[PDB]
Design a protein around this nucleic acid. Structure first.
Lengths: 82, 99, 93, 5, 103, 82, 99, 93, 103, 6
DNA sequence: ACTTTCAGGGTGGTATGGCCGTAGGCGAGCACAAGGCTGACTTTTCCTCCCCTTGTGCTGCCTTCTGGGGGGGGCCCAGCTCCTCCCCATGCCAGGGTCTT
DNA sequence: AAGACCCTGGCATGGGGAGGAGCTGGGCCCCCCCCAGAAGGCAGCACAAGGGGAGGAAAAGTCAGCCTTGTGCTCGCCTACGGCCATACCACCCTGAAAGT
């Protein structure tokens, strides 16, 4: 069933994200923390993106719904339409 | 025995390699499954454009990279190089996300 | 000079509904007025964008209801929507 | 008189 | 009966409609839009006023002051999120000391 | 009002501000840092308030000019109108 | 010799006293002089409403109190009770005022 | 028959002005489109609020100029204001 | 000639005028408002393109990719301040490492 | 043929 | 490369905005005091910063199996477009109730 | 308490959006295969953390001084209001061309 896919954000993937941020040494408890942070961020944007989608009485979440949900969240994304 | 690099220089090697590149650092299919699973809790039988999931991934990865920069700053403040969950919590709290 | 109008009369009426024996000072009433103006501009501004996204020239109660959902967090949105939906139902009836 | 939550 | 009376509100349904039309948020404004907005604004105000009045009673006072409004907003996490970037003039801060600083 | 008016933010004044923030011990180099931080914040808000006033062809910086400048800064302030 | 409190108890008493109150903690005349000195660099011969200066003072004081709370968190992070300039700098950097 | 709105032609002309021998990718060009759409919405929104505050029903080059001053920081606003006035002077004359 | 060419720009003065009128910003739009906005939009584009184009030349390339725009934006303090809360897709980050980092 | 500030 | 939908021009009207004139009201400035707040000095004590030692937790290298990713194909549900027309929102005239001084 | 005026009512009207029908496009699902990478493990070592100690820099108390703040008055410059009138912008008719698929 579609459950526990947050483990698909593997330890090597988080290390790559941390390495791009300049981190050298990463504690073992970081990976559970980063997964909890990402889930909260995704839940926030997806909630607003779906709200835009049901407003237009649509069933497919467009790239522009995500851009609108991000922009209202505070973060503006360039390269997917305006 | 074969040569073994001193612990730490491989970290700078990876830092340079992953800061020079702009590719997405999370596998696309696991992230797509995660996005579809989160959105299932809001509305059932949803559909996603490919660019929708691409935009979600780009936003999430940029956000995580910025958060890790802030966490690294918090770690350096405490006279450390190993980032810990308390560093993430402090960076988020000063950023106003914990409220 | 011209006269200035705000929500002071209605805020007093709402306060009397919840707390019959509690007053409100002048400085507190000024803050309540600024709070109502702030939320009105937030909801209307979001509903303006929301209607323009769908190429709509009209702002309806659907636009307000979704603007409430986007802005009000958690159970604040849930209860506000029910109050807003109940009021509109009573108004049309 | 008035209360919701 | 005034428009607010029909909707059961104590807020200006008519004046909000004038505000919606005046603010050029759209070319046209629906009939039920002012009624929905006035109900939301009244509900939010009543929510704060009940919380602020409770704070005044806790502070054994019979009048609401901006400090009481600040206590109500910051204590409720739902209103705190809504008004996260809002400054209340003469509101002070929530009384809170970190445990590690205490003896 | 010509110069050296930042020193009007005296050391006891900054200490009272820190106490409201829950600070127990304050370093001796904090006061100079707090004065510079305050000055930068005031310059940003005043530049926006004066810009609003100059647009309306006025000479008196109204309280609404300050409220509008703060809202532009993302620092909404209640109690002075709106 | 008279009775002398141990250091820290008076600090806690001041913390409680100033967190229980809502007064302005900066003298009004020096702050007004500072505001007029700053504004004179943009437009000469300006005039200020009393409410304009009061709004400026309230905004500045709220901003400074919030910044000091963030600085206190940064100080506790480094295992300290004394707030230092580097704590303020880190709090400003994470907040975005210096990125 | 629905149109597609973009500044791709004009960005191409501007790019050929500053960098004669340099092209721009498809993804990079879509970034420039979002940037122009973003800044247009910022200045127009600021000019709208400036006209509303002074109870003006029109948006003039003075509203646009003040909006540029409020948004663009530092030497960006000084040069943007200078370029705008030079264009307007040429447009009328 | 055309309105754009009369002002001496490359951006569409006529297209900007419609967007200002259609976007519900004010009941009327002046004659010089679209001309002023087009001049500013063209200037801001030329600044980024010149900086981004220089990035490709220094990175021994010939075509601008989203990475070059990010390098130009984040390196310029004025452009960085204007676009502080803006994410550039496929932009990566600026290569920067702390001083305490290096042994 | 179009240069800007340094 | 073609076009057809948008760019550009001229004219009527009128609603918006500029210019003059005015009256008052608020903002800047000046005395005066008295005292509450500030600035400086001393003592000290308690926090900070440095050093050391160590044990644990992180890193680095290897091996192997798994699953992400790429190709190729098929369905069909959902999204976009055009006609119609019916119903809601707007504008104008008239009246009267309310909420601000 | 009075009344200025804005909200409500009634009616005529143009236009917007909602249903219906139709087409088609890509989102989803499947299958196969490969090899790049993740997961587990082991050896090593380096870093976080506790303990100890010196010193110096904040805190607390004391006291002398000063400059803030409350009260009162003057001047006069600015700002909101009102009226007159120019004029620039919107809508409509007409003609013509430009970049997007």
């Amino acid at each position: 069933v579609l459950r526990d896919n947050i483990q698909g954000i593997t330890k090597p993937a988080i290390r790559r994200l941390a390495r791009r941020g300049g981190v050298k040494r990463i504690s073992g408890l970081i990976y559970e923390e980063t997964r909890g942070v990402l889930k909260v961020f995704l839940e926030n944007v997806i909630r607003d993106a779906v709200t835009y989608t049901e407003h237009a009485k649509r069933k497919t979440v467009t790239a522009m719904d995500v851009v609108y949900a991000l922009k209202r969240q505070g973060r503006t994304l360039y390269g997917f339409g305006g | 025995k074969p040569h073994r690099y001193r612990p730490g220089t491989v970290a700078l090697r990876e830092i340079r390699r992953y800061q020079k590149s702009t590719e997405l650092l999370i596998r696309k299919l696991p992230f797509q499954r995660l996005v579809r699973e989160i959105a299932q809790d809001f509305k059932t039988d949803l559909r996603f454009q490919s660019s929708a999931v691409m935009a979600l991934q780009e936003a999430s990865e940029a956000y995580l990279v910025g958060l890790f920069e802030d966490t690294n700053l918090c770690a350096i403040h405490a006279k450390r190089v190993t980032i810990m969950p308390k560093d993430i919590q402090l960076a988020r709290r000063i950023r106003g996300e914990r409220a | 000079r011209s006269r200035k109008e705000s929500y002071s009369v209605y805020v007093y009426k709402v306060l009397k509904q919840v707390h019959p024996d509690t007053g409100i000072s002048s400085k507190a009433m000024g803050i309540m007025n600024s709070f109502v103006n702030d939320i009105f501009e937030r909801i209307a501004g979001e509903a303006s964008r929301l209607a323009h996204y769908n190429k709509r020239s009209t702002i309806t109660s659907r636009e307000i209801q979704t603007a409430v959902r986007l802005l009000l967090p958690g159970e604040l949105a849930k209860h506000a929507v029910s109050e807003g939906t109940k009021a509109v139902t009573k108004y049309t009836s | 008189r008035r209360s919701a939550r | 009966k005034s428009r607010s009376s029909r909707a059961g509100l104590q807020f200006p349904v008519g004046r909000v409609h004038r505000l919606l039309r005046k603010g050029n948020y759209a070319e046209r404004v629906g009939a039920g839009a002012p009624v929905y907005m006035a109900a939301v604004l009244e509900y939010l105000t009543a929510e704060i006023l009940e919380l602020a009045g409770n704070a005044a009673r806790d502070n054994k006072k019979t009048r609401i002051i901006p400090r009481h409004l600040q206590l109500a907003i910051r204590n409720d996490e739902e209103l705190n999120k809504l008004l996260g970037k809002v400054t209340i003039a003469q509101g002070g801060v929530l009384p809170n000391i970190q445990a590690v600083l205490l003896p």
